[PDB]
């Protein structure tokens, strides 16, 4: 299937493409031709990946100099595996068409914990542990000692990789993570480091955001080599939250105590090093005078001189002083306090800690800790986190804020206070990506309206188009139910949350919808506490028992183990005729991680508009700062955060292969024009005024009829 696109001719593996695919390809080609960053939305969970990859490959063939390589990022490794599968299929199709191999390379990066071949680190699954063990095995000290070949466990894979892969790079091919593990085992090399080196000469590289956003690890692999590369973020509508998380650092009392203990161990190790080997490790002082990774981005990062901290004892005392200041500032009991610049000024005044020497604290920590030949960085990780916070605060506070919480939420009195350093704008941390890369395409599904995104992230978009899925059959028939059998408002307001009548309306709607809907249904609440209250009310009444009789019921919990077990049983229930009703939370990690396909989550129920609690002070900074700068109304941003989350958690049923399914929102709030307007275009256009505010019974009847229509073949 060769498509005569306006720009050029583009190959395509599958037989047919919908008109929305034509629109997507033409708009994407327009953006690439303009060579300017832009954002676009496409409904389908699958199909967008293949269309995007095919268009990018064709554009690379036409103008190889224009685009050096493609950097395609996905939320999670299980998801990016499907992307690499799609890319492998496309490459096989193109190779068959051409009749011969071409110099094209495509690979996926992942954590050493996810992929590795060392038996010692294999049993351990905790990421910091894998990082520390690998650092110990690959340490420059361990490398030098391996040169001596003394009796000590040395990781042969990295040494063999240094010997061979340095000389010879991999010719070409596509390697999934699992297949790359096998390749590393066969060749006695690192599946991780081999891909890391291939990044220098790779046409396509795929990895999650935390490999491309956080300055600590993103920069090293996203160096200026890709000066003009097509960087693409997929389903990255929750990009602001992750970009903020890449900067926010949380300091707790337990973490601070662990830091103090680690610092004591550091002092003891320094004394032992002084008595054992002093001159050779002191040469570090000379190289320092000449002049865990830094959290400072490219331009913000500075390397002039370490500062007043030039020796191990001096640096240790500096950390002692700063840790004492943080300890006392956290121990203070008072209302939540915000102080972005005042915190730095008060630190400098109270404990005599100048911001310039504080700036290089984390970098000097890395160097000095390397000198100590520590067993691993896992033990001292809390100290490195505190150092990253210490350097960040002295680095900048213009678009940041230090929040102190002597008392935690959900606890009238708790002896574990927490100090947050949550950011307020993601533009600060995502600026390097936009500036360095010629164009970035934020391709997303279920995207809340694009107009806000340029305001939140400071960039000038080239194209702003919303693509609506078009099929010969109406795959999706969304509806909103606001009126119950009692013709009573069913809004899940904070003041209306306690309403037993509203809870009863929700329970009856779920009962009837489970009675009619086929096997497999997922209901998303607004919070764990609200979900528990509704479940308890239904349990006190007889509605819950009737729901249990009609279909099996499963519930989500904060604990990941129970969540995984419940979802595993839910899948089997969906396969069998019992069916299942999975209650979950919109913010729950399960909602974002899981993907619902044919005969999975057939009818997506949304109980109440997803709104975060109006007491969490972090969102207060994040929101009022957005009001002050970029001029976004607080209510506007709050409703945007609700609609984007709802679209995220309700857009799964249309994953791909044209699998029918209905999305019912049991809240009259969605019927409001603002919510409908902010809803994604593809869902909204299907939505109509006739079914906008159906009663519970009318919604059930129309759902039954729509399921009848979708049951029959094409």
């Amino acid at each position: 299937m060769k498509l005569n696109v306006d720009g050029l001719l583009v190959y395509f593996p599958y037989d047919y493409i919908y008109p929305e695919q034509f629109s997507y390809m033409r708009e994407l080609k327009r953006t690439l031709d303009a060579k300017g960053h832009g954002v676009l939305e496409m409904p389908s969970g699958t199909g967008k990946t293949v269309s995007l990859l095919a268009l990018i490959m064709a554009y690379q063939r036409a103008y190889p100099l224009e685009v050096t390589k493609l950097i395609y990022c996905s939320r999670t490794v299980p998801e990016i595996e499907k992307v690499i599968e799609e890319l492998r299929k496309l490459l096989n199709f193109y190779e068959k068409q051409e009749g011969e191999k071409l110099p094209f390379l495509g690979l996926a990066l992942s954590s050493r914990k996810n992929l590795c071949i060392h038996p010692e680190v294999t049993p351990l699954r905790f990421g910091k542990d894998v990082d520390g063990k690998c650092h110990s095995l690959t340490a420059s000290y361990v490398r030098a000692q391996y040169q001596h070949d003394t009796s000590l466990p040395h990781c042969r894979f990295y040494e063999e990789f240094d010997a061979h892969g340095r000389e010879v790079p991999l010719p070409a091919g596509i390697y999934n993570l699992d297949d790359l593990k096998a390749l590393g085992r066969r060749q006695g090399w690192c599946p991780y480091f081999l891909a890391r080196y291939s990044i220098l000469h790779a046409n396509v590289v795929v990895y999650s955001y935390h490999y491309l956003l956080d300055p600590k690890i993103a920069d090293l692999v996203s160096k200026e080599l890709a000066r003009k590369a097509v960087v693409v973020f997929d389903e990255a509508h929750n990009i602001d939250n992750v970009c903020i998380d890449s900067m926010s650092v949380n300091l707790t009392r337990r973490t601070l105590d662990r830091c103090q203990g680690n610092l004591e161990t550091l002092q003891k190790t320094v004394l032992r090093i002084k008595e054992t080997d002093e001159q050779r490790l002191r040469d570090e002082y000379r190289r320092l005078v000449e002049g865990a990774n830094p959290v400072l981005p490219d331009e913000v990062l500075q390397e002039a001189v370490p500062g007043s901290i030039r020796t191990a004892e001096h640096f240790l005392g500096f950390l002692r002083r700063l840790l004492e200041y943080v300890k006392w500032r956290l121990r203070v009991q008072h209302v939540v306090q915000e102080s972005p610049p005042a915190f730095l000024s008060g630190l400098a005044q109270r404990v005599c800690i100048q911001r310039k020497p504080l700036r290089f604290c984390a970098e000097r920590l890395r160097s000095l800790l390397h000198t100590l030949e520590i067993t691993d960085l896992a033990d001292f990780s809390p100290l490195t986190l505190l150092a990253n916070f210490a350097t960040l605060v002295s680095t900048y506070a213009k678009g940041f804020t230090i929040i102190i919480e002597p008392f935690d939420d959900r606890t009238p009195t708790i002896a574990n206070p927490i100090l947050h350093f949550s950011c307020m704008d993601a533009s600060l941390a995502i600026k390097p990506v936009f500036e360095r890369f010629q164009s970035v395409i934020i391709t997303s599904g279920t995207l809340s309206p694009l107009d806000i995104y340029p305001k939140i992230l400071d960039f000038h978009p080239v194209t702003m188009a919303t693509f609506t899925m078009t099929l010969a059959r109406v795959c999706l028939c969304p509806m909103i139910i606001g009126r119950g059998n009692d013709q009573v408002a069913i809004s899940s307001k904070f003041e209306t949350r306690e309403d037993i009548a509203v809870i009863r309306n929700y329970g009856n709607l779920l009962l009837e919808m489970s009675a009619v809907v086929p096997d497999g249904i997922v209901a998303f609440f607004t919070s764990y506490q609200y979900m528990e209250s509704t479940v308890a009310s239904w349990y006190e009444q007889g509605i819950l028992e009737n729901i249990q009789r009609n279909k099996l019921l499963f519930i989500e919990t904060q604990d990941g183990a129970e969540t995984s077990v419940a979802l595993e049983k839910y899948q089997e229930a969906c396969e069998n005729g019992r069916g299942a009703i999975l209650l979950s939370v919109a913010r729950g990690k399960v909602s974002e991680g899981i993907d619902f396909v044919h005969h999975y989550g057939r009818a997506v129920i949304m109980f109440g508009v997803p709104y975060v609690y109006t007491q969490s002070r972090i969102l207060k900074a994040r929101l009022e700062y957005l009001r002050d700068q970029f001029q976004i109304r607080e209510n506007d941003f709050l409703t945007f955060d609700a609609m984007r989350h709802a679209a995220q958690c309700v857009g799964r049923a249309i994953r791909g292969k044209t699998d029918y399914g209905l999305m019912v929102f049991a809240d009259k709030r969605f019927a409001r024009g603002d919510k409908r307007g902010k809803l994604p275009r593809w869902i909204q256009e299907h939505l109509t005024d006739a079914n906008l505010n159906l009663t519970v019974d009318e919604g059930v009847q129309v759902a039954k009829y729509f399921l009848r229509q979708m049951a029959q073949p094409f």
Binding site: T311, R320, E324, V351
Partner: protein
């Protein structure tokens, strides 16, 4: 307040944390209920060490770590010296070399004998006070004044923003 207790009367440190450390030439975790016990007999003598004190050598401080208490007080005293701004020296190394010597002096004073430090500090007193020390006292006073002025300007702007949006709504 996290300290287990005074070397002698570790009681108050358990009942209430209101007591704050008292700095002395000895460098000690002294506590007010124990300061009264020192005043009654000796009147300015460390109980165990017996170090003489002119006038009780007592000043309030707030950190559970006695080492941090001594280090912070010594740094407070030292900052009065070597306060010249960085830009006064064009040499790249000299920017932080003198700070290295300053912190070395602080660590020296914390534990080792301070006689050499005092003699050196006399030498720096004579040579630098002639011109530079008083000049940088003036400049640091100017920057303290202007930082307090700038914070009051920030808070005037925030009060005006609050009250003007309130008057927008009511108008």
């Amino acid at each position: 307040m996290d300290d287990q207790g005074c070397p002698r009367c570790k009681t108050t440190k358990y009942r209430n944390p209101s007591l704050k450390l008292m700095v002395n030439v000895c460098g000690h975790t002294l506590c007010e209920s124990c300061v009264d016990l020192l005043f009654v007999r000796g009147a300015g003598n460390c109980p165990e060490c017996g170090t003489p004190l002119r006038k009780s050598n007592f000043r309030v401080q707030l950190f559970e770590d006695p080492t941090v208490d001594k280090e912070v007080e010594i740094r407070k005293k030292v900052l009065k010296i070597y306060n010249k701004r960085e830009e006064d020296f064009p040499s790249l190394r000299e920017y932080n070399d003198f700070l290295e010597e300053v912190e070395e002096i602080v660590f020296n004073l914390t534990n080792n004998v301070d006689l050499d430090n005092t003699k050196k500090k006399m030498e720096i007193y004579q040579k630098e006070n002639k011109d530079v020390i008083q000049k940088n006292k003036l400049k640091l006073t100017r920057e303290q004044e202007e930082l307090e002025e700038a914070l009051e300007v920030e808070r005037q702007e925030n009060e005006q923003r609050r009250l003007f949006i309130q008057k927008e709504e009511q108008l």
